[PDB]
Structure 1
Amino acid sequence: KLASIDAQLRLLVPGKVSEDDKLVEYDALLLDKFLDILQDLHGEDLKEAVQQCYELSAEYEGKHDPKKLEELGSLLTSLDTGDSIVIAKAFSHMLNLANLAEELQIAYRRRIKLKSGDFADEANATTESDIEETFKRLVHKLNKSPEEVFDALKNQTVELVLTAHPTQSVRRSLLQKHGRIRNCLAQLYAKDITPDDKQELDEALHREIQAAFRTDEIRRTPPTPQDEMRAGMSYFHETIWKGVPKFLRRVDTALKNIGINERFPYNAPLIQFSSWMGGDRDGNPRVTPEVTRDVCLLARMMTSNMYFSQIEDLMIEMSMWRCNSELRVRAEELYRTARKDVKHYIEFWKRIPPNQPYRVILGDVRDKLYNTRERSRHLLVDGKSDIPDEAVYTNVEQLLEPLELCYRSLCDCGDHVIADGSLLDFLRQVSTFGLSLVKLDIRQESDRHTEVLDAITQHLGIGSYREWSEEKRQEWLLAELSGKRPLIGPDLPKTEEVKDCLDTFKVLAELPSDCFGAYIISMATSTSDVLAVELLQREYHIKHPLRVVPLFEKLADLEAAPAAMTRLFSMDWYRNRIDGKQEVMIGYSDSGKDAGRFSAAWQLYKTQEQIVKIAKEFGVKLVIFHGRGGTVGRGGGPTHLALLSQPPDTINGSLRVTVQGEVIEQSFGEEHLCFRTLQRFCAATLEHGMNPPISPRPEWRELMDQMAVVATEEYRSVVFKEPRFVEYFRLATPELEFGRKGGIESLRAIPWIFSWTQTRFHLPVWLGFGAAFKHAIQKDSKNLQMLQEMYKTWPFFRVTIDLVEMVFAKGNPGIAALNDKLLVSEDLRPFGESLRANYEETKNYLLKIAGHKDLLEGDPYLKQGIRLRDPYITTLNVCQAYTLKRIRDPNYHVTLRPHISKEYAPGLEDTLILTMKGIAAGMQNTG
């Protein structure tokens, strides 16, 4: 049964099993129970077919014999649509189980007691510094006083911006099933388990696996953006909402342990969450002003609902009858004006007596939270509400105030100790999540603002903004930014795009400012791009204009950014507007699509240095907002070192980073990982501003510059100049099929990365590194040693290589070869072959530079997790390849096996969507 499955799994991953290494055991137990379920639901025959696919794939992952892929292919292409769907569902579900098991292993893996002190320790969760160890290094090694460390942390802000799962927003219900599977699993391994508890936990585990597997409706319609946002907010309930105060309490403990005798102030804004879900409309016209309004109200509804749903518990605890005057007076006020009758609440449904004074205060907070929640709900569903302003909270201060009053009163009556329990936790939740637990960024591309302004200029009869030079655009924008009359009259002609863009500003002017964060400009190139958005916000008389944040994407745009920023910072109107602060966004995957990932990485390092210097010179504080695709978006320990690798002064007390949708599950799904994620963000941010990495040696810059010219040239000659690259890309990847659910340049970065990730080839991540390495080594043999010294000694270089190496570990060029054979026409097959030759050569240079014989010999726990997933992913790759063939070629047919599954009109496109989601869930983050 179990032992035999353990046996097969163990062959896949040799390693040195101590007591805390249970990952293979976990996976065996889950696969075993899932196979019983499949047999039950679908029959022994189907179960055996799954087992056979698994076996062939595991054998292929052993020796990589192409024959095993062919057999696997023969089996899978012989299945009818019904059986295909069951098999893709099965293998997708096994990937999710394996991920949950891995999360449990990471959570309980033992910490290394004596850390070597090298920066490399910060790349691995077993060795990284926790917040206290970070405090102690800063005190003992950098000679900071405890007070200086405390004071910097109090002024620090970490902002985490959640973006949508590129493929599969996981619904709340299923998430909760996944959590209970993970728990049953952990409890099965609890010390001293009685046999009956074990028997019952076992049957509970079986049941939860099945419930999750059978949560599988294939819903005709794409998910609406409102549903995608709500799905994307599920992690707050599952872990983050409680996780924040647990981490802030660990900060209190750590402070205490370095001799600071106060708690971290409950209202220091150390942690802030934001979102792009319903705010980013770049290249996405489904994101309408109505969508943006709805996700603001949803965020407000959920936030007030989360406070409301925990206030009764706090009321129960706050039974104390000793209070100070201030609160006594307020309680007697509320008590006198108090309703004689039933409130339809679970717990305190009769009038609260005045000898329960804290309950009287908190009872009023509950009524306000309830009304705040209901208003938002009526605004969403009915389009408005008769609930008035003084019945709800419109600012966070109104909510904090009575809580602070409870706190002071307890402190004044001798009960400080009690105040620092749930009350303190609640205060911290209010201060972190406010009235909208995420602030929403708006994003739209620069050309849309140009178009809007052009419609205005031409209607005014003064010419065409689009025809104007950069100087003229600046001049006219600054004149109108101090203009005395509005720009927009009621008969301005508006195309649908122009209207859609203006109406977004209208929503911004109408909704409360605490709903919003930054206004990000995609494809920004110039000063005027930023002033353009400033003028539209001024025209709509927005009381608190959103800060305007350019996103410079292409290499050329990155090179022009410094002069653009310098010109902004020189303009009095703008300096006055921004009040000493500017945020700029970089997009790793964006820049990498333009120039190759190697050159984007190096150019982004340089551009950040240059912008930081320009900000200093102008006395402006700069925040760099990290978009997706960087070493800082990996999650887990690698994020810790990535943060510490940043160029000096680029953090300076304020971190803003994207948490990519495909990473959210690993970062925040399990509560220990959620805690350790918050911790490494806060610790690294703190450390970096007081302990910058080494700046590179001049020889290293020069070689980096030389390598970038070559990397870019290789990347661009393959991707942009080879006239048949596009055609090869459309055949070898599922790119076209993903898109229906101006070349690569007008293809967006997520489909670019995603399409090549699906085939296990990952061209967007590594292409260009090979030529860079080879050219450097061949120009001068000494460069091999220089590169190895950079890997060992230069944190930027180290993390940049490690991310590529992880992506190689998820790669398998045999999958791409099978796709070439099935999908690509014969005359392009040599092209596909030469790319595979570049992959191999590039991987081998990287290995040589890293000093590794094998992929990830640095990080065997990460390699182990990747290897355990591989057979499942491989089965899905093969299923997908033959599915694409059938879909593309209505005359491709094979003899079909009699239907295998029992029960007791889905098509090919349904099977495809299942493979694509499962493969993406197994690959998680790459480029």
Structure 2
Amino acid sequence: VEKLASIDAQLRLLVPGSEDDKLVEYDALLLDKFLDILQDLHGEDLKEAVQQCYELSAEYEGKHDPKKLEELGSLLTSLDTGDSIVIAKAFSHMLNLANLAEELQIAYRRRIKLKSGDFADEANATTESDIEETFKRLVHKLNKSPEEVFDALKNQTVELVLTAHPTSVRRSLLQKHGRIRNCLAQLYAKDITPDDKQELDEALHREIQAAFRTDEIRPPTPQDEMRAGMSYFHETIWKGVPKFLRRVDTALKNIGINERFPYNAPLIQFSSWMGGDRDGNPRVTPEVTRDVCLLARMMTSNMYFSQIEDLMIEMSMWRCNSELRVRAEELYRTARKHYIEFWKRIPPNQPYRVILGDVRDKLYNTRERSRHLLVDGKSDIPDEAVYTNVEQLLEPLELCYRSLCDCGDHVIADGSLLDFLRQVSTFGLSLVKLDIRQESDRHTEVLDAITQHLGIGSYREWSEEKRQEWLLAELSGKRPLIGPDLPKTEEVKDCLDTFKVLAELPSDCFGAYIISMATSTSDVLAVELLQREYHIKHPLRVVPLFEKLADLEAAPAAMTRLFSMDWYRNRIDGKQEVMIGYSDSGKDAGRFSAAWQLYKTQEQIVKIAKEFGVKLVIFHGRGGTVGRGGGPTHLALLSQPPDTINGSLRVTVQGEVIEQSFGEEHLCFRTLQRFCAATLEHGMNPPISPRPEWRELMDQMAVVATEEYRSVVFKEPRFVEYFRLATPELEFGRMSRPSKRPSGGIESLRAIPWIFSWTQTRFHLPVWLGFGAAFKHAIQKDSKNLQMLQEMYKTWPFFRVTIDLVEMVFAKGNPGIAALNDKLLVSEDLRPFGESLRANYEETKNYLLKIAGHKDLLEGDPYLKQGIRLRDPYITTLNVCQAYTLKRIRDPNYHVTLRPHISKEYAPGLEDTLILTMKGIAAGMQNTG
């Protein structure tokens, strides 16, 4: 009768339970159904094996008895390659289930009705403010008129830049995840028949299996990796955006604005790095970039195309204004179809349809030109027949729209037509615009080739002042720099060709050219010059990304110098965007010192832009508090230094967060919602400025933290051998892209790998190291600092948000895993070094607690804690499995007695098991640094 109630009972033990809190039930059902499936497919024997692992991991998660971990080891390590693959798949798959259940729980959790009004409320989905509440706060708590709010909003832009998953999932598998999540959602609805329940049951059972059996063993091209993206948009964002904008409309009613948000106001914009970012990544060629533009153009046209037919059916009206009636007549007159819904000709009896039919053909053509260009390279298709610019596509829709209003039918015009206008206006002809990123040294290499080939010396050898002097001269040069007959290395050709691609393609494909490892004025001019050389008609804006602390300290001088140049001031036309990267900067100096430095740098650069009349946009690269997703993003955005958003947000949406943020319609909606709300609020309601005591203490702690971080990571010569052993970092490095930009050392290692290696291991060093020294030293210098730190946590959003993130990571941390790793993988001489780090973990964690005023991690956030506690047993099993696998890979001569093979049925090795393991853990850990 009842496997489930028991599985529920044994799942409750992990987190004690309440009202709309279904998570444990959800997880229980999913798990119980999943076990049956393992039984059918692989046999009782294996099912038990899987349960045993779970029981052990769970028992471990409760008490934390290192014995349990070893028992688990004995089990996992005794499995042949075949069975371990299966277990690895199993746990890796129960995780994805646990995440769906959590998405669903988060989606339907009840909002708190009366909120404290504290800014802390904005760090949690249940208490944060929706758009209407935000408007109201601004109007009533801040004396802004509705008109002023409406106005702010009309001018606001929010750009979400999508990056590729650092490990990324299949469009099929997504949809199974959706179907499973829906079956589950549906099983919990009252007024549900025994039959429907029975049928939903088998539907659920079936869709889990279908997912489990979609598990083929692999690398994939940038093109496919990107063609991935065009899914999530279909799946959720494409529909999400109109839904949200309609909510904006409703919210404006309720504060007394009697009009809808203009359909062409560019409130929300999307962008991408996929096929764009070539930094330390030679797989991203010019041809790749040409292909992702054409794909983007294609698919977008296709989307507009597959829904136009539905709008056409809906638009059965015959009453129109004359403006339209003319243009319809024209179009019927000029007539004399590959697809089928409307495969016929259409009576001018129904004019809206005539227009939209033309639109459809044009969309189809636009689809086809991009398709042929993509596969052939030529296409015999006139610009006349096709949308080369979004205005061309809006125009007929605006026509219909106006016509409807004029005939007295605005109410109808504000239905699907409006949604469609909003989609077109948000997504344009290219769903995402592509950013280009390359590292400064590359532009230097190119310019050096040029200068040397010209016989004038070596750009590399020149001083900054010289580079600037030369660059400006040539920026007004009266004759080209570059011949066809210039000697080029493959890299230089690759780089130059990227500009040939930028010149050939329509500019509505592209966003910014980001310069990785920027450090100077010359770095930006260099890119400007090459754009001029290739006669790019609408050059992309150049965006320096300042990474290292020193580079951040130098940035203000660099920006000031830029803004001092008339050539440059006039090219940028009042607008500059600068990029920052929390992970990057924190790899240099620790997370703490990087956080603080970035606060100040933004402040200074804002001040500098203000002085020169420049609107400054700060592009948030990965690693922020602001890329967490969920409520915490809400507060993180409000926590930003004053005037740093100023109506224009641009942030990275880290791949490892795209599912949480967008994969479910409600979360999708609220993601969009908070980005828009927070951005709006901030420009009219900055956080308080830090008290000077706080700046002073923060400066003092930064030095100590950076000292500790660098002591351990760069100064200590034992560290890299430790890292290489205690961590799958090397094995990761036989992949996404070369994680060492072969030079050797941590400074050489890229940040994603850095973060990822220590996340696998549950130890998370890159995120907390240096916080402990900083805290300890500040308290030991003066016990009154504890009070100050606490006041800072209570009152200073930046600080709060900074500590919450590190707290969340400790909650996903477990030093026992780190300890097991030492014991299995690390040599006897390095173990005390490990012990030492674990000691620092603990001490850091405890200070962090003392400062937030919590006994236990996440007291402020039981729901998040519950989510984590539930995932853990699964992750733990993967950690352990991983650890022994790493052993067997590294040590050809480690062997133990293998249990006779357990899986039934009715070529793969350790490396395959390790990948499964790396991906399960990564998906269980989501974002950290």
Q: Flag whether TM exceeds 0.5 (same fold).
A: yes
What is the CA distance between 1:490 and its match in structure 2?
1.8
Looking at structure 2, the residues matched to 147 and 29 of structure 1 have their Cα atoms a distance apart, in angstroms, of: 50
Counterpart of 1:190 in structure 2 is: 189
State the shift of 1:348 in Å. 0.6
Q: Secondary structure at the match of 2:150?
A: helix
- Could you tell me how far 1:338 is from its partner in structure 2? 1.2
1:734-813, aligned counterparts within 5 Å?
Answer: 734-739=728-733, 742-813=744-815
Q: Determine which of 604, 623, 639 is the counterpart of 1:629.
A: 623
Secondary structure, aligned partner of 1:98: helix
Question: What is the deviation of 1:417?
Answer: 0.4
Deviations 1:208-267 (A, max 9, x none): 00101101001xxx1111111111332101110000000000000000000000000000
- Could you tell me whether the CA contact under 8 Å between 1:157 and 1:269 is conserved in 2? yes
- C-alpha separation in 2, matches of 1:863 and 1:233: 33
CA contact (8 A) 2:316 2:350 kept: yes
Unaligned runs of 5+ in 2: 734-742
The superposition leaves residues 388-434 of structure 1 with CA deviations (integer Å, 9 ceiling, x where unpaired) of: 21111000011000000000111111111000000000000000000
Give 1:491 deviation, angstroms.
1.4
Q: Which residue of 1 aligns with 2:20?
A: 20
- Check the 8 A contact 1:170/1:232 in 2, yes or no: no
Structure 1 residues 654-696: Cα deviation after superposition (integer angstroms, max 9, x where no partner): 0000000000000000000000000000000000000000000
Shift in Å, 1:380: 1.3
Distance 1:742 1:570 in 2: 39
Contact 2:230-2:299 within 8 A present in 1 as well? no
Give yes or no for contact 1:238–1:669 (8 Å, CA) kept in 2: yes
Partner of 2:321: 324
1:298 and 2:295 are equivalent in the alignment? yes
Partners of 1:333 and 1:89 in 2: how far apart? 61
Tell me the distance in 2 between the aligned counterparts of 1:388 and 1:456: 38
Structure 1 residue 802 displacement after superposition = 0.1
Distance 1:421 1:507 in 2: 40
- RMSD (Å), alpha carbons: 0.8
Contact 2:582/2:594 (8 A) holds in 1: yes
- Asked if the contact 2:471/2:526 (under 8 Å) is kept, the reply is yes
Q: Distance in 1 between matches of 2:466 and 2:626?
A: 39
Question: SS of the residue aligned with 1:12?
Answer: coil
Quick one: distance in 2 between partners of 1:311 and 1:92?
A: 40
Q: CA deviation at 1:103?
A: 0.3
Asked if the contact 2:78–2:896 (Cα under 8 Å) also holds between the matched residues in 1, the reply is yes
Q: Distance in 1 between the 2:885 and 2:229 partners?
A: 30
Q: SS at 2:115's partner residue?
A: coil
- How many residue pairs get matched? 917
Q: Which sections of structure 1, spanning at least 5 residues, go unmatched?
A: none
- 2:619 is paired with a residue whose SS is strand
How far is 1:831 from its partner? 0.2
Match of 1:54 in 2: 54
The one of 241, 256, 269 equivalent to 2:266 is: 269
Deviation at 1:895, TM superposition (A): 0.7
Structure 1 position 327, deviation (Å): 0.7
C-alpha distance in 1, partners of 2:52/2:813?
Answer: 23
- How far residue 903 of structure 1 moved from its aligned partner, in angstroms, is 1.0
What displacement does 1:742 show?
2.9
Deviations 1:598-625 (A, max 9, x none): 0000000000000000000000000000
Q: Distance in 2 between matches of 1:197 and 1:121?
A: 40
1:298-350 Cα offsets, whole Å, 9 max, x none, are 111110010001001000000011111111111111101113xxx13231111
> Any conservation in 2 of the 1:446–1:529 contact (CA below 8 Å)?
yes
Match of 2:36 in 1: 36
The answer to whether the 8 A contact 1:352-1:360 is kept is yes
Deviation at 1:19, TM superposition (A): 2.2
Distance 2:57 2:398 in 1: 60
1:275 CA displacement: 0.2
**1:824-858, CA deviations, whole angstroms, 9 ceiling, x for partnerless residues?**
01100000010000000000000000000000000
CA deviations over 1:450-471 (Å, ceiling 9, x no partner): 0000000000000000000000
CA distance in 2, matches of 1:380, 1:298: 7
SS in 2 for 1:829: helix
Kindly indicate whether the alpha-carbon contact (under 8 Å) linking 2:165 and 2:656 is maintained by their aligned counterparts in 1.
yes
Return the offset for 1:724.
1.0
Equivalent-residue separation in structure 2 for 1:854 and 1:224 (angstroms): 45
Q: Structure 1 CA distance, aligned partners of 2:391 and 2:808?
A: 46
2:251 paired residue number: 254
1:23-44 alpha-carbon deviations (Å, 9 max, x no partner): 0000000000000000001111
The alpha-carbon deviation at position 869 of structure 1 amounts to 0.1
Please give the per-residue CA displacement for 1:279-303, whole angstroms capped at 9, x wherever unaligned. 0000000000011000111111110
Shift of 1:386: 1.2
Aligned to 1:524: 518
Match for residue 546 of structure 1? Answer: 540
Q: Residue 746 of structure 2: SS of its match in structure 1?
A: helix
Deviation at 1:592, TM superposition (A): 0.2
1:191 deviates by 1.5
Q: Deviations over 1:878-921 (max 9, x none)?
A: 01000010111111111111110011111111100000001000
Q: Hey, what does 2:740 align to over in structure 1?
A: none
- For 2:518 and 2:857, the matched residues in 1 are separated by 38
Percent identity for Structure 1 against Structure 2: 100
Deviations along 1:41-80, whole A, 9 cap, x unmatched?
A: 1111111100110010000001000000001011001111
Match of 1:334 in 2: 331
3-state secondary structure, aligned to 2:113: coil
CA distance in 1, matches of 2:230, 2:349: 39
Q: How far 1:874 moved relative to its partner?
A: 0.4
Q: Tell me the secondary structure at the aligned position of residue 128 of structure 2.
A: coil
Once the 2 structures are TM-superposed, how far is the Cα of residue 188 of structure 1 from its aligned partner? 0.2
CA–CA separation in structure 2 for the residues paired with 1:346 and 1:90: 44
Does structure 1 retain, via aligned residues, the 8 Å contact 2:134–2:677? yes
1:565 to 545, 559, 581: 559
Deviation sequence 1:504-544 (CA, Å, 0-9, x none) = 00000000000000000000000000000000000000000
Give the superposition deviation at 1:203: 0.5
Superposed counterparts of 1:158-177, under 5 Å: 158-167=158-167, 169-177=168-176
The whole-number CA distance in structure 2 between the counterparts of 1:591 and 1:201 is 50
SS in structure 2 at match of 1:523: strand
User: In structure 1, how many angstroms separate the alpha carbons of the residues matched to 2:314 and 2:427?
Assistant: 23
Q: Please state how far the C-alpha of 1:806 moved relative to its aligned partner.
A: 0.2
Cα distance in 1 for residues equivalent to 2:602 and 2:202: 55
1:189 & 1:575 partners in 2: Cα distance? 60
User: SS state of the match for residue 551, structure 1?
Assistant: strand
Deviation at 1:877, TM superposition (A): 0.4
User: Once structures 1 and 2 are overlaid, which stretch shifts more, 535-544 or 741-750?
Assistant: 741-750
- Residue 375 of structure 1 deviates from its aligned partner by 1.0
Please say which of residues 352-361 and 146-155 is displaced more in the overlay: 352-361
1:732 Cα deviation from its structure 2 partner: 0.2
Q: 1: distance between equivalents of 2:331 and 2:169?
A: 44
Question: 1: CA distance between counterparts of 2:626 and 2:451?
Answer: 42
Are 1:12 and 1:868, in contact at CA under 8 Å, matched by a contact in 2? Answer: yes
For 1:883 and 1:371, locate their aligned partners in 2 and report how far apart those are by CA, in whole Å: 53
Runs of 4+ in 1 over 2 A off after TM superposition: none
> Post-superposition shift, 1:448?
0.1
Q: Please report how far the alpha carbon of residue 387 of structure 1 lies from its aligned counterpart in structure 2 after TM superposition.
A: 1.7
Q: Deviations over 1:616-653 (max 9, x none)?
A: 00000000000000100000000000000000000000
Question: Could you list the per-position Cα deviations for residues 797-826 of structure 1 after superposition, in whole angstroms to 9, with x for gaps in the alignment?
Answer: 000000000000000000000000000011
Tell me the secondary structure at the aligned position of residue 270 of structure 2: strand
Whole-angstrom distance in 1 between the partners of 2:451 and 2:65: 66
Secondary structure of the 1:117 match is coil
Aligned 8 A contact 2:472 2:567 in 1: yes
Residue from 501, 507, 510 that aligns with 1:507:
501
Measured after TM superposition, the shift of residue 383 of structure 1 is: 1.9
